[PDB]
Scaffold this active site. Sequence first.
Site, PDB file in Angstrom:
ATOM      1  N   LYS A  66       0.827  -1.198   0.000  1.00 49.42           N
ATOM      2  CA  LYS A  66       0.000   0.000   0.000  1.00 49.42           C
ATOM      3  C   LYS A  66       0.864   1.251   0.000  1.00 49.42           C
ATOM      4  O   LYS A  66       2.060   1.198   0.291  1.00 49.42           O
ATOM      5  CB  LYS A  66      -0.993  -0.008   1.171  1.00 49.42           C
ATOM      6  CG  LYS A  66      -0.424   0.176   2.534  1.00 49.42           C
ATOM      7  CD  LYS A  66      -1.529   0.558   3.530  1.00 49.42           C
ATOM      8  CE  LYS A  66      -1.821   2.054   3.473  1.00 49.42           C
ATOM      9  NZ  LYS A  66      -3.032   2.441   4.254  1.00 49.42           N
ATOM     10  N   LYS A 103       7.801   0.950   0.765  1.00 56.67           N
ATOM     11  CA  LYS A 103       8.307   0.295  -0.441  1.00 56.67           C
ATOM     12  C   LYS A 103       9.641   0.883  -0.915  1.00 56.67           C
ATOM     13  O   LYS A 103      10.590   0.149  -1.214  1.00 56.67           O
ATOM     14  CB  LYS A 103       7.281   0.383  -1.570  1.00 56.67           C
ATOM     15  CG  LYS A 103       5.988  -0.356  -1.296  1.00 56.67           C
ATOM     16  CD  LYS A 103       5.027  -0.306  -2.475  1.00 56.67           C
ATOM     17  CE  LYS A 103       4.587   1.102  -2.854  1.00 56.67           C
ATOM     18  NZ  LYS A 103       3.940   1.878  -1.763  1.00 56.67           N
ATOM     19  N   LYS A 132       4.169   8.899  -7.102  1.00 56.58           N
ATOM     20  CA  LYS A 132       5.000   9.622  -6.140  1.00 56.58           C
ATOM     21  C   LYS A 132       6.433   9.219  -6.447  1.00 56.58           C
ATOM     22  O   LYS A 132       6.889   8.152  -6.036  1.00 56.58           O
ATOM     23  CB  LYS A 132       4.614   9.295  -4.701  1.00 56.58           C
ATOM     24  CG  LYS A 132       5.306  10.185  -3.684  1.00 56.58           C
ATOM     25  CD  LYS A 132       4.899   9.826  -2.269  1.00 56.58           C
ATOM     26  CE  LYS A 132       5.468   8.489  -1.854  1.00 56.58           C
ATOM     27  NZ  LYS A 132       5.035   8.061  -0.483  1.00 56.58           N
ATOM     28  N   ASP A 183      -1.636  -0.199  -4.317  1.00 56.67           N
ATOM     29  CA  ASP A 183      -3.000   0.048  -3.833  1.00 56.67           C
ATOM     30  C   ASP A 183      -4.014  -0.562  -4.790  1.00 56.67           C
ATOM     31  O   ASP A 183      -5.130  -0.929  -4.390  1.00 56.67           O
ATOM     32  CB  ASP A 183      -3.232   1.547  -3.690  1.00 56.67           C
ATOM     33  CG  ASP A 183      -2.190   2.191  -2.829  1.00 56.67           C
ATOM     34  OD1 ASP A 183      -1.203   2.742  -3.370  1.00 56.67           O
ATOM     35  OD2 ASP A 183      -2.320   2.073  -1.605  1.00 56.67           O
TER      36      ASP A 183
HETATM   37  N1  LIG Z   1      11.244   1.041   9.047  1.00 55.45           N
HETATM   38  C1  LIG Z   1      11.044   2.370   9.063  1.00 55.45           C
HETATM   39  N2  LIG Z   1      11.376   3.148  10.121  1.00 55.45           N
HETATM   40  C2  LIG Z   1      11.174   4.482  10.115  1.00 55.45           C
HETATM   41  N3  LIG Z   1      10.640   5.146   9.081  1.00 55.45           N
HETATM   42  C3  LIG Z   1      10.275   4.473   7.958  1.00 55.45           C
HETATM   43  C4  LIG Z   1      10.455   3.028   7.886  1.00 55.45           C
HETATM   44  N4  LIG Z   1      10.013   2.633   6.678  1.00 55.45           N
HETATM   45  C5  LIG Z   1       9.568   3.744   6.042  1.00 55.45           C
HETATM   46  N5  LIG Z   1       9.737   4.832   6.803  1.00 55.45           N
HETATM   47  C6  LIG Z   1       9.369   6.223   6.463  1.00 55.45           C
HETATM   48  O1  LIG Z   1       7.994   6.266   6.054  1.00 55.45           O
HETATM   49  C7  LIG Z   1       7.803   7.201   4.991  1.00 55.45           C
HETATM   50  C8  LIG Z   1       7.253   6.524   3.734  1.00 55.45           C
HETATM   51  O2  LIG Z   1       8.165   5.510   3.327  1.00 55.45           O
HETATM   52  P1  LIG Z   1       8.356   5.152   1.759  1.00 55.45           P
HETATM   53  O3  LIG Z   1       9.386   4.066   1.754  1.00 55.45           O
HETATM   54  O4  LIG Z   1       8.511   6.430   1.045  1.00 55.45           O
HETATM   55  O5  LIG Z   1       6.897   4.509   1.444  1.00 55.45           O
HETATM   56  P2  LIG Z   1       6.255   4.059   0.015  1.00 55.45           P
HETATM   57  O6  LIG Z   1       7.452   4.024  -0.940  1.00 55.45           O
HETATM   58  O7  LIG Z   1       5.673   2.739   0.358  1.00 55.45           O
HETATM   59  O8  LIG Z   1       5.251   5.103  -0.338  1.00 55.45           O
HETATM   60  C9  LIG Z   1       9.168   7.796   4.689  1.00 55.45           C
HETATM   61  O9  LIG Z   1       9.233   9.088   5.284  1.00 55.45           O
HETATM   62  C10 LIG Z   1      10.145   6.807   5.290  1.00 55.45           C
HETATM   63  O10 LIG Z   1      11.363   7.451   5.677  1.00 55.45           O
HETATM   64 MG   LIG Z   2       7.669   4.981  -2.797  1.00 51.37          MG
END
Ligand SMILES: Nc1ncnc2c1ncn2[C@@H]1O[C@H](COP(=O)(O)OP(=O)(O)O)[C@@H](O)[C@H]1O
Ligand SMILES: [Mg+2]
Lengths: 268, 268
Positions: free
Chosen positions: B10, B15, B41, B128
């Site tokens: 999601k 990711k 994004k 999603d």
């Molecule tokens: N294990 C974790 N511990 C702390 N922060 C995390 C962790 N995994 C993700 N984040 C934070 O959560 C937010 C979204 O992560 P992201 O990897 O960009 O999600 P997605 O790519 O799934 O949209 C970011 O600000 C990231 O730094």
């Molecule tokens: Mg992402």
Amino acid sequence: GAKVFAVYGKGGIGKSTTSSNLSAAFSILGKRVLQIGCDPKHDSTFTLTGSLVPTVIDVLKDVDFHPEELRPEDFVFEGFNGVMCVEAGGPPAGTGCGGYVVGQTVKLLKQHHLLDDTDVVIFDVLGDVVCGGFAAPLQHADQAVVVTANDFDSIYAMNRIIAAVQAKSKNYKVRLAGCVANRSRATDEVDRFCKETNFRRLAHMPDLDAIRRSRLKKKTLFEMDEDQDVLAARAEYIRLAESLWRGLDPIDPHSLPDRDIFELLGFD
Amino acid sequence: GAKVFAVYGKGGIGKSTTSSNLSAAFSILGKRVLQIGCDPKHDSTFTLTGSLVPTVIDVLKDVDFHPEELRPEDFVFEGFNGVMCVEAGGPPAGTGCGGYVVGQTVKLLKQHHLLDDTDVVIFDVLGDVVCGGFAAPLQHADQAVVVTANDFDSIYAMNRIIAAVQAKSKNYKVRLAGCVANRSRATDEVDRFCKETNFRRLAHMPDLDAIRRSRLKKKTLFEMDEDQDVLAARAEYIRLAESLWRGLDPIDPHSLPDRDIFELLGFD
Ligand SMILES: Nc1ncnc2c1ncn2[C@@H]1O[C@H](COP(=O)(O)OP(=O)(O)O)[C@@H](O)[C@H]1O
Ligand SMILES: [Mg+2]
Ligand SMILES: Nc1ncnc2c1ncn2[C@@H]1O[C@H](COP(=O)(O)OP(=O)(O)O)[C@@H](O)[C@H]1O
Ligand code: SF4
Ligand SMILES: [Mg+2]
């Protein structure tokens, strides 16, 4: 005819909470209401019926995808204070297009003339993408409402949804009403975004104990047992419903290039 | 040829965090790596390059959608320790299929043999929904990895992603590797779900302040100032990379009906 609203936003941001409590508020204001869940997470109308009603995809499977055999009583259910409820559900495994069940739902709504003979229609729609069946509610809506928090991901999604809605402007009557800032203490980031895009914050619903519990009791704020915390939250939903019913003055917002959202929110 | 991984889940679940640190881990293990962002994004590869690189949609626009004119140098960028980076971006919202740019990106990768001449490829994909171009990486992946936490929405999304991957498995080589439990203290709900579905938790990454900081600092964990947690986190990303490289036993999970996820996790 009905005033038709389509509620979009990122996943888990409060679309169903906002939609269901708005539907309840409109019902309390004396309006006939129909809420349609348009989301593979098929609990849009859960707090209106106190249950997960049979979904459109459920009942389609039962008639082996011969939707001509369905009647409104098969997929339209009465909930709180007479609010009528339809829940699309999501497509089965393997399905080409992710919006297919929403498309089938909107087909049935039109074939059974269900947008007629009611006062308010609220579509509660997945907005992580807006395309295919997920864009279908835009063909019918008078106003689009985006639910957002202050986080980067919800504002970025809101910006993309604004672009998606405006891309229909020469084909559909739908226009953007604004956003509901939801489940946040304040609204600094949302307001910064709105100022840059000439967008409008319609309402602010804090992160409320009363709301979280309502979902756990399988009820809307309005069906809940009366206490003080409930009363304040109810009032803001009533206020928002009143403003949408009355109609607002127009906004003419714009979406930012996606790249510029990173810049605006300090994330590049 | 390259071992090809596709990371789904999601929105906002981790990711790009998982993908970028895995890419960095494989690089540290001495592997040539290509990471492809497949998400509107468009910050998938941000922490590898320390910047928002030009996206595939950026360059497609510039050549007026004649992909013929593009060379790898137009859309493949150098990042941390030689990790190579492509960022799809998303299409103009509201105009067509949300997956369009991911579809075009996959075509470009194949056209230019970019899956053939590296050791590890990681697709970082919106999940999603899994349809249209968003499902295209599954036509090339050896293994699909789902990022999840213990919350309802991410497990519910994972359940639907399992079904989507298995649908592609009928016509394509891709299999499910399992899930990465991310940004959670323990894995109680994830493991309950895995036990019910015969799925597998491949790794667990706690919620680390250094990870959140790394994104703001535009770098991976492998470049963050060292401490007990950061070393453990790096070691876990290394262990995961090592396990994916050597390979795990084949699993045969089953997705549950959506309604049954509400039941299992106590949300009905
Ligand atoms: N294990 C974790 N511990 C702390 N922060 C995390 C962790 N995994 C993700 N984040 C934070 O959560 C937010 C979204 O992560 P992201 O990897 O960009 O999600 P997605 O790519 O799934 O949209 C970011 O600000 C990231 O730094
Ligand atoms: Mg992402
Ligand atoms: N303003 C709020 N205050 C407290 N809890 C909220 C609020 N808005 C939503 N929630 C809770 O957040 C979760 C997700 O909300 P929901 O409306 O189901 O999201 P969506 O429909 O956008 O996926 C639910 O458990 C819900 O009760
Ligand atoms: S139009 Fe949208 S919902 Fe349909 S396949 Fe494309 S991305 Fe998926
Ligand atoms: Mg919902």
